[PDB]
Design an enzyme around this catalytic site. Structure first.
Site: not given
Lengths: 496, 496, 496
Positions: A110, A122, A383
């Site tokens: 993904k 995960k 960020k």
């Protein structure tokens, strides 16, 4: 049938790896025999498949009643090519090593599809969150973080946890605080250890609607492509388009909101406890307001309850945004939607895909479609590394440039036409003026999300065209992901 | 004559240091005696000259045939003022401590000219790469990296290796992988340990043409300056300009490509084995295609082989982009080119410079001209620290702003002229539309490269004007670099 | 039946934990209810049981023939109470997560019995070492070390690997070199990352005979205890004692050597391919010499081949030092040995133990008996932390003190008896003189090993007496280990 965390993911890789094997051998610049090249390609594909690191934990907590409990946890990292890893933490009683391994592999592909430079990861904690108080869940989360940190599984340069369905932004604050307290210490980048934090803690604006916006932009890219719409026999664009949303969670709500904003009509809304149907259309704002106070969507006015199965409702496109295996071989022939947009993870079975391909039903893969959340979590991670909100140093500067550009046009025209025509005031439009005044970080994030979904959709189309795939976008998405992970590992400089 | 890595570099510093000594004493704000000030200026200039750290290595490898070999390597760092250092690794049998010392000092001043905040460094491995297989070269590179890493000579905050002529991007992957495996560990910035990596590994677009583009922009800045062109008696701009490229390597090919793109005409192309000549002009694309299949440029159609020496060919500007000492005192009087653009390193002898200065032949220094590669390697280093490709979060946002600006002009004009004139569609031009659609990281890198070469050219001109130098841009380039390194060290806060 | 790495180990803990539960509740100084105390004791016993960290790996190697292989590896750490962990690495095709988990737990209790301040650990690489060349095994070992190091599983303060049966001291050098090269860096204690190294690398003298010596000292402690020998109806001491050694590996050879040195007689020696029997006795030196050249022990002169099963041979004590499940319920009634000394791991089934207990056959547990190797590996780890061999600074000093003591006795006697009696020379005996001249590190190590086995045997006897156990030394050994691990964790200061 097998769930999403089952051999489906492994089967997707196996099918994709076989398809790419022929092309990769031909486009190999190294000088060697054909048998030597084919072994090298097959050899690397074997390296990519498994998860290289899996950690199993067992740590104690003491419950509020005073009893003692031992909690099992897992963290599978799938990073042979890129670091850091990124993946959520799932609190469920049925989590297993096989499940986290499958989901860690899924996150790797993904991330590759949307060009996010992360490996897959995960985590799973084998508890039922409804049986623990908030004080206990905090102790579980903090202790799980400590064990992960000591073994190099949670660092900002190692592995960045993300919120899952069972964990909110409250848990992310616990993870971030625990990491900084113990091992993050005084590292400047320790703030980027986790994503999904609250805004005050360094979280990013527009995270809530990220997955919904990505679903909209994924559909939009494939709805405006003339070649694909010609195959489906539909006019391009959202004009006179009807869609049905199965499930009204966070993904379903925001997907409907942005679709209705661009002219699409929601003729039906599904749910576990009921269904809603209205040929005229359903207002996303009114339905959202009804849901948040009544606790459900049944009995919503201006629309009678739907009769039958919501999946088989007649619509231009369909959005399964809840649960798994909703579309099976049984109900696939009766589906009347030309386009299926997998908002949730694995809502169609591999058997159902074959029927859809025969019926010329385009199925936009969940691997690409719901990758909006992964993309924005990547932006939040950036960020926190930048230690500044996006556009803080540029909004005022760009505003001055925009006004200087308009004044340049105004003065140039005024001297061209002289006193004749008087003054020609060049001012921003109302839409532009709102954009200038309301400029904020969320505008940058939504712009970056739209750019990522647009670019990835083009890459998937090229991959589908190169490998002669038709409407099988799912294989094209996996094939596109396999090639990227192969190239990164092949050129990673690891020993061969 | 002395090679480039010889007392030429030391002589260049010595001449430059003497020139700047008088001005630095006068423009010293500290309160002290004139003798005290002059000693301080001369004292700091002595500190700047030598390389503060030089490491000599001797490590073993076992060859494929089973024999044992001990390989000698060097790494000179020239950082009394700035960290990290940056410099390439040269695999050659004739490398020496003196050579890497001279090239480390040269990189320090080259970085200072283009305002790249790096110190100078250079590595040398005393092997002949043609006598080793790819398996052996990997072992040499990895072992050399390990020894460098243990002694604090290869870190992203210490010293960033770069590709040289004898090392490609394949070696940089070996260096990057070795650093991360051993000492980089899980540092977030460990990706920036080396530059010149492949694109998949974090490399930057436009690195291949970086040096060629820098040569073009260096010439362009000095070709459009009226004051200099008046001295040479030539019209400004590339209109009706003829150039000769000596050497058809990476620098020579790309330099010719961008010059021809802007109206210049390539009347001749030199090479070690032959020469090509055509007054009509040589198409860079056709010549490149011929070279990559025939293995050379001789026998290229549409142009007869040149007669005589390619350096003495009649042309407006000349680009020596291969080898060293091509322009000596012997052939300098016969050179008919008004401008000499040093694409390669040290293609003119100090004796030849004196003749060119007498003949009013502008010689654009190699210290500034071929600094495009250093500038882009700086951008790649920043990209790896940013962990995101340039413009990924701004391309879509800026595109929307551009369309809002045009709509503002359109709506303002439409209401100004009312129904009269109908609609005035304001749309981007074809050139702008391609720029919008094809926006990518390489556009940002090329923009930043052009800005750096433009700004540095202006600084060199001011330095030449301040010190009453004429067409001696080489001294002005060194004097400009000496002042910057002096100021950084003087204000560095080190103990005096 | 279940192997040693099976529910046997879990069953041993379960039986031991139930036994200690009653006593621990009573001897709890905390003020709380009886139900609160019992929950606390049972709660901690649940924390102790599982392995808190288990790491699963999958890393690639390229074989010499050029093919590609993915190798699976595991490392289970059992440390809720102490760090570092210590455990071997097993190269076998049948290794599994359950196996390494069981062996990691077993090492925790083995270390506790002999008061070694280590947690339990165990590694497994799922390969068959006979199918790989020495070049390939080195790459497997080095790559396995790198993956372990990156995740904090191999450090000197974290987890110290040890040699197993399938890995020799050659592999330990590979592990130590790999650790120092990558992550050990310039840590002073990086030498202590692994044990079992060669002598030149910091290994310890007497490691080869460590397990054999421990078996001898374990038997010696229980053979000189009057209370136990009275139950068995045997005279204390090794006088007129006959023993049978099943298996002639490293443990069997050294156990026989030290037993014969102290008056015991080896009347039979077993082996997989044959058996040897001689009522007169078998010389360990002659049998060792025969084995190392003929490759086996069959056909050894001075002793006819044994008839029947070696385990049922008539002897005072028996030493099963090879394989597992040799003593089962089937052959237990026919065993004629009063004492069974488990040299190997799990040579008796839980069913066999019940028959032996009925027949008053003392079974010295393998948990305590073969702990000599663990004790010496602890000494080697201390030696590498000390960075000096044992006794290097004291051998000469103690020698001078010993001679001064004898001179004090000599002078005191001479002046007491005056000229009468002449001179009374007080000189060390021949045995003492050899000890003084041949003093070395191995003397210190053997002394420390003998002290550890003696002290642990006394503790096991007290535990057996406190809990009213009889000859069930196996449960006493586990009960003794459970109490120590419980106390360490209970007082560890971890949150309750």
């Amino acid at each position: 049938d097998d769930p999403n965390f089952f051999k489906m993911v492994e089967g997707f890789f196996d099918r994709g790896a076989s398809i790419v094997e022929d092309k990769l051998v031909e486009d190999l610049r190294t000088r060697e025999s054909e048998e030597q090249k084919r072994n090298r390609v097959r050899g690397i594909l074997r390296i990519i498949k498994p998860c290289n690191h899996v950690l199993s934990l067992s740590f104690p907590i003491r419950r509020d009643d005073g009893s003692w409990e031992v909690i099992e946890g897992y963290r599978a990292q799938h990073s042979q090519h890129r670091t850091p890893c990124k993946g959520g933490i799932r609190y469920s009683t049925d989590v297993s090593v096989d499940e986290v391994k499958a989901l860690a592999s899924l996150m790797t592909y993904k991330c590759a599809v949307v060009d996010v430079p992360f490996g897959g990861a995960k985590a799973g904690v084998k508890i039922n969150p409804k049986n623990y108080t908030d004080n206990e869940l905090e102790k579980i989360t903090r202790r799980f973080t400590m064990e992960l940190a000591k073994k190099g599984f949670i660092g900002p340069g190692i592995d960045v946890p993300a919120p899952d369905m069972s964990t909110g932004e409250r848990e992310m604050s616990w993870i971030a605080d625990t990491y900084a307290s113990t091992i993050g210490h005084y590292d400047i980048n320790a703030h980027a250890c986790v994503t999904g934090k609250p805004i005050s803690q360094g979280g990013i604006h527009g995270r809530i609607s990220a997955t919904g916006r990505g679903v909209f932009h994924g559909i939009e890219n494939f709805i405006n492509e003339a070649s694909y719409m010609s195959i489906l026999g539909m006019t391009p664009g959202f004009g006179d388009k009807t869609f049905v949303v199965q499930g009204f969670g966070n993904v379903g709500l925001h997907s409907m909101r942005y679709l209705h904003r661009f002219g699409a009509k929601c003729i039906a809304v599904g749910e576990s406890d009921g269904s809603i149907w209205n040929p005229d259309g359903i207002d996303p704002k009114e339905l959202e307001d009804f849901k948040l106070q009544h606790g459900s969507i049944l009995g919503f006015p201006k629309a009678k309850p739907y009769e039958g199965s919501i999946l088989e409702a007649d619509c231009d496109i369909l959005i399964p945004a809840a649960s798994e295996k909703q579309l099976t071989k049984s109900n696939a022939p009766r589906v009347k939607a030309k386009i299926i947009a997998e908002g949730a993870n694995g809502p169609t079975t591999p058997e159902a895909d074959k029927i859809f391909l025969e019926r010329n039903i385009m199925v936009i893969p969940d691997l690409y479609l719901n990758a909006g959340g992964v993309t924005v979590s990547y932006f939040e991670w950036l960020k926190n590394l930048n230690h500044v909100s996006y556009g803080r140093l540029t909004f005022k500067y760009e505003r001055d440039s925009n006004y200087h550009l308009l004044m340049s046009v105004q003065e140039s025209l005024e001297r061209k036409f002289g006193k004749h025509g008087g003054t020609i005031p060049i001012v921003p439009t109302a839409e532009f003026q709102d954009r200038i005044s309301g400029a904020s970080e969320k505008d940058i994030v939504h712009s970056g999300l739209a750019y990522t979904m647009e670019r990835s959709a083009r890459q998937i189309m090229r991959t589908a065209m190169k490998y002669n795939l038709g409407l099988d976008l799912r294989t094209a998405a996996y094939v596109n992901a396999i090639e990227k992970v192969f190239k990164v590992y092949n050129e990673a400089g690891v020993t061969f």
